RNA sequence: GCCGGCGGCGACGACCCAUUCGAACGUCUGCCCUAUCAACUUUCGAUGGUAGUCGCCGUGCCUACCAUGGUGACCACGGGUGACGGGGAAUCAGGGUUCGAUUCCGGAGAGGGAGCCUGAGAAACGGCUACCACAUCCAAGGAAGGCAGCAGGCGCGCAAAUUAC
RNA sequence: AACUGCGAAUGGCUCAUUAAAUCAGUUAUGGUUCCUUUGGUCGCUCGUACUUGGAUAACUGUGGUAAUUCUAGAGCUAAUACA
């Protein structure tokens, strides 16, 4: 027994198809608009706003 | 396993003492008592998390073993001393007395009473048994056990007991319109008046309370106790008046006091 | 260029104490020591610094705050009694005897084995 | 085989090395706690009767009192036993004891001088021997000195006479436990005095409970007329 | 201290009742694979009855004398489990599948079995007693053992940290 | 230092065992024990007391065995120990 807490989460999630032009295009747009450093950060709020859309889904 | 435990985990403290995770891996542990371990309060955590008096556990100690507590005008070193519900803990070096009430959300509120209030306290009999000579004996929700009861106190009846002595100065009855508490369960801290109870013979008896504000909730027997004559009260209330207001107002009172 | 904020007080007579939290404004230069905190609250409170006792400074990211706790006794016997033993050492009013943990439950065990006055000839 | 000879009259004790078969055998074949007369251990020894008391064998193990056999015997010994301290409350050890008879496989043997003989051995009778310390207990004084009841104790209590180099002498003496002082009587009237309260708190509660149930039973009456 | 006795404030105790912390026996409903396990249990207690014994008590728990019962294709009984059981975890449209030795709760055991002292509480293993397997010292007479506590070492293997304060 | 009181039955570790067993939710002890805490009870009994008895540690002194937290013999002395 320690008196820690072992509760993380992880932010983004990866794409199903792994290579696929259309999307590779989508996300380098944004990384180029927004100066973002890699496609983490493009999944990530791709992520937090599919958890927000869940919840609005799920509450309508 | 092998004879009594003497330790508590942190996580499997009971949840209205609110002790964070990260703090430590053990917990308290309320001592032997006349009130439950679920159901009491450690005066470790009513000094150092709720009178923000304490820092660390030594401070505790150190503020008990100076004698300057007492609970139910009697003197506690014990710094993990059960003191439950209607417990008055009394600090006469800063002149300060509390009475262990609920509050609405269902833990124990630091509700402060002046000190001529903090000389009696209303207690729910048990049983009632006679014994040896027939001096007939009643035994109370805090174990205070009382000889020669007056014989119109009857089970689940509450009784007004003056801590200096440990005789009855007045009695409630337990019947239809009496203002009750509830010590258990969802309701847990709420305040309302009797409308009827259920009887199931070889079950809990069921009764259901009306609130002030028109809402009506049922709760066990076992988890009721009388604390006014009709409707008027013979305690003082905490902050809320026992009113379980729902999500929606306590959202609108928050950003209204905003 | 330092300014002492005080937040939450208390006038604890349990303990004989007055105990708040210390908020320190220092913007240009390093994270003050705990004597010029010391002598700066105990010429705002007009008490001497010796009966003063400050620890657990967090200096906030960027640098313009620190916040951390204080607390000043109303004598100093009071604060030799109730204070721990570490926050003495610290002003030097306590000393620690130089001794490991190893050397005390070697020397315990090695006493286990003899019995009787001969306990105490065993060092 | 040694003799470990002590007289408790004197307080003294000497090992003696006997390596003589014919001074031992008289002593060979014969019991614990059993008199010998000690004369073929030499001239000195006249009139010396001598009690066996304990001893060791060559592997150095000690002999208890009951055991009615020659060598060693493995024994589970509990408290009260000789041989044996236990190191926990109730706590029983499996251990070799000698035999209780004594034979020629003896390291030591353990003499205590029961009476006299014609004239002093040198090492224990002719020196002096001085018991200490004594009476801590008031009856004890009483009963060493022979003091009537209204005779004082702590005026005939014995002091030990200290003095140690480099200090001036010091003569201390006991706090002597069991003995009436007005702290005593005190304590005793304040037992007392409680029994007195209990009894008149019964009764006050008892009269006031009647009192309360005369006019209850006498309404829970009146009601009953309808 | 009060007019030779009478007393206030505690601390250790204490038969018994209540209480708190429990603990122990039960009630109902719920578990993975297997028919190349279809009948099982009852000589030596299986199911029930009467009387006791023993136990902290209820009871085939055990003894005596009687009855011939009790469970079973709604899967008994037997065997297997790289089975401690839950609170949970991973994945995921809806339904599901798989994992859960592991920090909280309950159970179990201190190399394998067995027996017991003390105590309110143990069939305790950083208590004892014996045997079985391993193994330490030795003057060969005897003596002393228990890491599945924290470090650490050997072994095992694809697989896991510092003889720290 | 030692006698006496209490604790050492908690904690920690691990998952070998275990298939209506463990365990989970729900009820029962009107069929039982319970250190401790907290209350009650404790001249309710009709028959040397202003304090009774004996020992043993500790300590001193003599020892044995190659050996262990092994212990025998001798001389005193305590109780909320033992009576």
């Given at each position: 027994p320690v008196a820690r807490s072992w509760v993380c989460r992880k932010t983004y999630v990866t794409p199903r198809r792994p290579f696929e032009k259309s999307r590779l295009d989508q996300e380098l747009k944004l990384i180029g608009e927004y100066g973002l450093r890699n496609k983490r950060e493009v999944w990530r709020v791709k992520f937090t706003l599919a958890k927000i859309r869940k919840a609005a889904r799920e509450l309508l | 396993a092998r004879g009594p435990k003497k330790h508590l985990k942190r996580v499997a403290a009971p949840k209205h003492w609110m002790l964070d995770k990260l703090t430590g891996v053990f917990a308290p542990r309320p001592s032997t008592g006349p009130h439950k371990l679920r159901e009491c309060l450690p005066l470790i955590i009513f000094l150092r998390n709720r009178l923000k008096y304490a820092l660390t556990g030594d401070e505790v100690k150190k503020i008990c073993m100076q004698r300057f507590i007492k609970i139910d005008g009697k003197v506690r070193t014990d710094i993990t001393y059960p003191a439950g519900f209607m417990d008055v803990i009394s600090i006469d070096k800063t002149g300060e007395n509390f009475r262990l009430i609920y509050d609405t959300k269902g833990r124990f509120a630091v509700h402060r009473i002046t000190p001529e209030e903090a000389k009696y306290k209303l207690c729910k009999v048990r049983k009632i048994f006679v014994g040896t000579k027939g001096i007939p004996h009643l035994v109370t929700h805090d174990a205070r056990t009382i000889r020669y009861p007056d014989p119109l106190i009857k089970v689940n009846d509450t009784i007004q007991i003056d801590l200096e002595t440990g005789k009855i100065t007045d009695f409630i009855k337990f019947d239809t319109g009496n203002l009750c508490m509830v010590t258990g369960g969802a309701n847990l801290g709420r305040i309302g008046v009797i409308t009827n109870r259920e009887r199931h013979p070889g079950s809990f008896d069921v009764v259901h309370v009306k609130d002030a504000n028109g809402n009506s909730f049922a709760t066990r027997l076992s988890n009721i106790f009388v604390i006014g004559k009709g409707n008027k009260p013979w305690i003082s209330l905490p902050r809320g008046k026992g009113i379980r207001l729902t999500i929606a107002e306590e959202r609108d009172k928050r950003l209204a006091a905003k | 260029t330092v300014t002492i904020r005080t937040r939450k007080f208390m006038t604890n007579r349990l303990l004989q104490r007055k105990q708040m939290v210390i908020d320190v404004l220092h913007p240009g230069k390093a994270t003050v020591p705990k004597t010029e905190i010391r002598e700066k609250l105990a010429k705002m409170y007009k008490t001497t610094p010796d009966v003063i006792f400050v620890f657990g400074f967090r200096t906030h990211f960027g640098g313009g705050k620190t916040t951390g706790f204080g607390m000043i006794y109303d004598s100093l016997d009071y604060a030799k009694k109730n204070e721990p033993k570490h926050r003495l050492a610290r002003h030097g009013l306590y000393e620690k005897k130089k001794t490991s943990r190893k050397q005390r439950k070697e020397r315990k065990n090695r006493m286990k084995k003899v019995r009787g006055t001969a306990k105490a000839n065993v060092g | 085989m040694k003799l470990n000879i002590s007289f408790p009259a004197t307080g003294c004790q000497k090992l003696i090395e006997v390596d003589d078969e014919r001074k031992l055998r008289t002593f060979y074949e014969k019991r614990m706690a059993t008199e010998v007369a000690?004369?073929?251990?030499?001239?000195?020894?006249?009139?010396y009767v001598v009690r066996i008391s304990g001893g060791n064998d060559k592997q150095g193990f000690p002999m208890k009192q009951g055991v009615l056999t020659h060598g060693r015997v493995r024994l589970l010994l509990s408290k009260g036993h000789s041989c044996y301290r236990p190191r926990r409350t109730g706590e029983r050890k499996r251990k070799s004891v000698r035999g209780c008879i004594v034979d020629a496989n003896l390291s030591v043997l353990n003499l205590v001088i029961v009476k006299k003989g014609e004239?002093?051995?040198?090492?224990?009778?002719?020196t002096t021997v001085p018991r200490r310390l004594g009476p801590k207990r008031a009856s004890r004084i009483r009963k060493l000195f022979?003091?009537?009841?209204?005779?004082?104790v702590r005026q005939y209590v014995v002091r030990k006479p200290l003095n140690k180099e480099g200090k001036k002498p010091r003569t201390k003496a006991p706090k002597i436990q069991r003995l009436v002082t007005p702290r005593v009587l005190q304590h005793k009237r304040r037992r007392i005095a409680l029994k007195k309260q209990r009894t008149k708190k019964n009764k006050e509660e008892a009269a006031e409970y009647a009192k309360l149930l005369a006019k209850r039973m006498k309404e829970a009456k009146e009601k009953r007329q309808e």
């Open positions: - | - | - | 000690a004369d073929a251990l030499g001239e000195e020894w006249k009139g004239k002093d051995i040198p090492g224990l009778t002719d022979n003091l009537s009841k209204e005779d004082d």
